[PDB]
Structure 1
Amino acid sequence: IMQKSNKINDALNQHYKLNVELGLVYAHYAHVADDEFDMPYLGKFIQHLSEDKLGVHKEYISDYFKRNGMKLKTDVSVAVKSIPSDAKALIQEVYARENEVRDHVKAIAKLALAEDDYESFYFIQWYVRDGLKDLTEVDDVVKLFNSSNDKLIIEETIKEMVEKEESEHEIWG
């Protein structure tokens, strides 16, 4: 009874890998944001995101696996070989990656229902919610580049964003 789904096990190992590799890319993008583009607050924003991916996003999968018999796999391959040309494009790339996260998560949820794995459907709810939350935070920064042509003005707004004491939306938080 209660035999773990091998299909969910694979999908969640692939999502663990995605969050590790994303976090490593974001750490690089945070360096570049500060170093090459002269936007240290944009750097801090991306760095916070790197740490989210390499922290809780991966941790919760490992924890879940310990509880249900699923096997963890660690297989990572990532290389930053090209960087976006400017800051606007850097954050737009981050946006595209977060949009893909939402698509991957949707798939896992759909799979959990197909496999009648209600514990996994429950688990993924955090990721479903976070898919949108994280995208929204990134979108809030993307908007800035369309609203001013002054990098320092944009930076002042990012500063408040990163320095605000984090509030949780009742639903998406």
Structure 2
Amino acid sequence: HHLKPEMIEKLNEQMNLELYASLLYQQMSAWCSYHTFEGAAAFLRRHAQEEMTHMQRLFDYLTDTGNLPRINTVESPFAEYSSLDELFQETYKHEQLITQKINELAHAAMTNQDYPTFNFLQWYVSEQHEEEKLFKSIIDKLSLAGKSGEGLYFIDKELSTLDT
């Protein structure tokens, strides 16, 4: 009648991963701002907020099922980036990690015959397809136009209102 402990903890850990993603994109916004990419910064701050809502959805599934979500220690998301391109390469990699972890969670759910949690997960499976499309689109814009300061100026302006 209740979630297995395995499933509870994997859901908890994914909630933390969503929280880390939020703090990551927030931290990356600082780099952007520091390096004068205000458009890239605004996009990343809005995307950080979005990741909180992914975190909250997991938190809510956990409480709705009679469990206690646990926010664990959070590693500093601080990193050096050599370019805006390398920053957004890292974003895409991170989103690929999140997709992997959701697929693992879905695999655990099916293997455990946890149909409620499999069903809950579908939101994330779908979301992660949209996330990879979004961030791959940014890398693609940069690989096309990003090799000059003018190109970066334009893409940075695009990012300032992207996905709004």
| TM-score calculated relative to the size of structure 1 | 0.87
Greater RCO structure (CA 8 Å; 6+ sep):
2
- Deviation sequence 1:127-167 (CA, Å, 0-9, x none): 1111111111111111111111221121233234244xxxx
- CA offsets per residue over residues 86-138 of structure 1, 9 Å max, x none? 10000110000000111000001011111111110110001111111111111
Q: 1:20–1:76: 8 Å Cα contact kept in structure 2?
A: no
Give, in whole Å, the separation in 1 of the partners of 2:62 and 2:143.
42
C-alpha separation between the residues in 2 aligned to 1:76 and 1:19?
Answer: 13
- Given that 1:4 and 1:69 are in contact with CA atoms closer than 8 Å, whether structure 2 keeps it comes out as no
Match of 1:49 in 2: 47
Q: Distance in 1 between matches of 2:126 and 2:155?
A: 27
Structure 1 CA distance for aligned equivalents of residues 32 and 78 of structure 2: 16
Q: 1:103 aligns with which of 76, 100, 116?
A: 100
Give yes or no for contact 1:98–1:131 (8 Å, CA) kept in 2.
yes
**In 2, Cα distance between the equivalents of 1:81 and 1:40?**
19
- Does the residue aligned with 1:76 lie in a helix, a strand or coil? coil
Structure 2 residue matching 1:79: 3-state secondary structure: coil
Separation (CA, whole Å) in 2 of partners of 1:80 and 1:116: 35
- Please report how far the alpha carbon of residue 11 of structure 1 lies from its aligned counterpart in structure 2 after TM superposition: 0.4
1:51-84, Cα deviation, whole Å (9 max, x unpaired): 1112x21111121112212231111222134321
- In structure 2, relative to structure 1, the CA distance for the partners of 1:121 and 1:162 (3 Å cut) is closer
8 Å CA contact 1:23, 1:51 repeated in 2: yes
**Aligned pair in 2 of structure 1 residues 160, 20: CA closer, same or farther (>3 Å)?**
closer
Give the residue type in structure 1 aligned to 2:72.
D
CA distance in 2, matches of 1:16, 1:110: 17
> How far apart are 1:41 and its partner, in Å?
1.0
In the TM superposition, structure 1's runs of 4+ consecutive aligned residues that sit over 3 Å from their partners are none
- 1:5 matched to which residue of 2? 4
The range that moved more, 154-163 or 62-71, is: 154-163
| Aligned counterparts of 1:71 and 1:48: Cα–Cα separation in 2 | 28
The TM-score normalised by the length of structure 2 is 0.91
Match status 1:152 vs 2:153: yes
Distance 2:100 2:163 in 1: 26
